[PDB]
């Protein structure tokens, strides 16, 4: 694994069009499929990608942890958790789009 | 490998004044824009500030959308220029409408044959959403495809061609019906546009893989395809498609 360790793995992920404040946002603004998008709350922030689950209840869900698999690490100092750490979706079988999501935190702040 | 440019400004221009070189995803603040969007630039060699805002390519992304879809926009932004989109009325209107200095809108398009035409058109503007997203350009400025949008003779109808005319369309979508016809055009064909009675330019029509195509390849019968009769035969939809703008002056 040390080894394999040597290439990290890759992601495309396309940016969706529709943006917002929150997942909420984006939904009323006809985003209505589960995946990907940035969103940006206030004007003095910097915009930030993150998962929309829009097929659960009535969407609008702007999820900001998750697991499945274990595939990131969670033993992590006060830092990384106040910056957020993990994969936030994707690249879903043979698409443009990261359609799945991954293991993260989406952080404190 | 999606990664975005640390360069702000007004347009796509304005990231090209400022430092800018590659053809790639910024964000851009118009002046009366109350937060600041995400926009996929294109540069050239020359210091060419493009602000797209519509592509076609495959066939992932359909474009048979509601108001409040095309209002706010749909599909996704590659910094490689691989994916389909319509950017959203609200944006092109805040975008190109920032006074003191005019737009133009320059079509490019593309064939299942290798051939690539451009057409041109002068002061662009798409008035706001009280205006109901309305097209209004000076006039057609040249290229080997064709001022499509000064309407186009196609059967046998003597005033098609004024009712094919776009220069002065407001936007219509299946759910806000603004195009003059006694039906919906943006049901027919199943897309959105400004649509008259009904176009002699679709760059948002369903799609078709190889080309041609005729009546019987909807139920319908229509041409719901990407057509723009200046350049080809209403038959035939395009494989790709673009829209941009850039100030005038850099012209």
């Given at each position: 694994?040390?080894?394999?360790?040597?290439?990290?793995?890759?992601?495309?992920?396309?940016?969706?069009?529709?943006?917002?404040?929150?997942?909420?946002?984006?939904?009323?603004?006809?985003?209505?499929?589960?995946?990907?998008?940035?969103?940006?709350?206030?004007?003095?922030?910097?915009?930030?990608?993150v998962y929309?689950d829009?097929?659960?209840?009535?969407?609008?869900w702007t999820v900001i942890?998750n697991?499945?698999?274990?595939?990131?690490?969670?033993?992590?100092?006060?830092?990384?958790?106040?910056?957020?750490?993990?994969?936030?979706?994707?690249?879903?079988?043979?698409?443009?789009?990261?359609?799945?999501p991954?293991?993260?935190?989406?952080?404190?702040? | 490998?999606?990664?975005?440019?640390?360069?702000?400004?007004?347009?796509?221009?304005?990231?090209?004044?400022?430092?800018?070189?590659?053809?790639?995803?910024?964000?851009?603040?118009?002046?009366?824009?109350?937060?600041?969007?995400?926009?996929?630039?294109?540069?050239?060699?020359?210091?060419?500030?493009?602000?797209?805002?519509?592509?076609?390519?495959?066939?992932?992304?359909?474009?048979?959308?509601?108001?409040?879809?095309?209002?706010?926009?749909?599909?996704?932004?590659?910094?490689?220029?691989?994916?389909?989109?319509?950017?959203?009325?609200?944006?092109?209107?805040?975008?190109?409408?920032?006074?003191?200095?005019?737009?133009?809108?320059?079509?490019?398009?593309?064939?299942?044959?290798?051939?690539?035409?451009?057409?041109?058109?002068?002061?662009?503007?798409?008035?706001?959403?009280?205006?109901?997203?309305?097209?209004?350009?000076?006039?057609?400025?040249?290229?080997?495809?064709?001022?499509?949008?000064?309407?186009?003779?196609?059967?046998?109808?003597?005033?098609?061609?004024?009712?094919?005319?776009?220069?002065?369309?407001?936007?219509?979508?299946?759910?806000?019906?603004?195009?003059?016809?006694?039906?919906?055009?943006?049901?027919?064909?199943?897309?959105?546009?400004?649509?008259?009675?009904?176009?002699?330019?679709?760059?948002?029509?369903?799609?078709?893989?190889?080309?041609?195509?005729?009546?019987?390849?909807?139920?319908?019968?229509?041409?719901?395809?990407?057509?723009?009769?200046?350049?080809?035969?209403?038959?035939?939809?395009?494989?790709?498609?673009?829209?941009?703008?850039?100030?005038?002056?850099?012209?």
């Amino acid at each position: 694994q040390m080894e394999y360790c040597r290439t990290p793995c890759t992601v495309s992920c396309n940016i969706p069009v529709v943006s917002g404040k929150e997942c909420e946002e984006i939904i009323r603004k006809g985003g209505e499929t589960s995946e990907m998008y940035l969103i940006q709350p206030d004007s003095s922030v910097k915009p930030y990608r993150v998962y929309c689950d829009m097929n659960t209840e009535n969407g609008g869900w702007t999820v900001i942890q998750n697991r499945q698999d274990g595939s990131v690490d969670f033993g992590r100092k006060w830092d990384p958790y106040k910056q957020g750490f993990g994969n936030v979706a994707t690249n879903t079988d043979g698409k443009n789009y990261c359609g799945l999501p991954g293991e993260y935190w989406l952080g404190n702040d | 490998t999606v990664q975005i440019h640390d360069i702000t400004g007004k347009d796509c221009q304005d990231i090209a004044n400022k430092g800018a070189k590659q053809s790639g995803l910024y964000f851009i603040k118009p002046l009366k824009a109350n937060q600041q969007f995400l926009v996929y630039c294109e540069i050239d060699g020359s210091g060419n500030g493009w602000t797209v805002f519509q592509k076609r390519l495959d066939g992932s992304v359909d474009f048979k959308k509601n108001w409040i879809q095309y209002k706010e926009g749909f599909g996704h932004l590659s910094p490689t220029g691989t994916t389909e989109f319509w950017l959203g009325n609200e944006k092109i209107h805040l975008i190109s409408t920032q006074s003191a200095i005019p737009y133009a809108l320059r079509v490019e398009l593309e064939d299942w044959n290798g051939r690539t035409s451009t057409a041109d058109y002068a002061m662009f503007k798409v008035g706001p959403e009280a205006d109901k997203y309305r097209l209004t350009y000076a006039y057609f400025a040249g290229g080997d495809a064709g001022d499509a949008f000064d309407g186009f003779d196609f059967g046998d109808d003597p005033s098609d061609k004024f009712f094919t005319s776009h220069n002065g369309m407001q936007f219509s979508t299946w759910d806000n019906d603004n195009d003059k016809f006694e039906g919906n055009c943006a049901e027919q064909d199943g897309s959105g546009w400004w649509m008259n009675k009904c176009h002699a330019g679709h760059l948002n029509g369903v799609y078709y893989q190889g080309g041609t195509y005729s009546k019987a390849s909807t139920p319908n019968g229509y041409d719901n395809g990407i057509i723009w009769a200046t350049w080809k035969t209403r038959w035939y939809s395009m494989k790709k498609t673009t829209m941009k703008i850039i100030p005038f002056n850099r012209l």
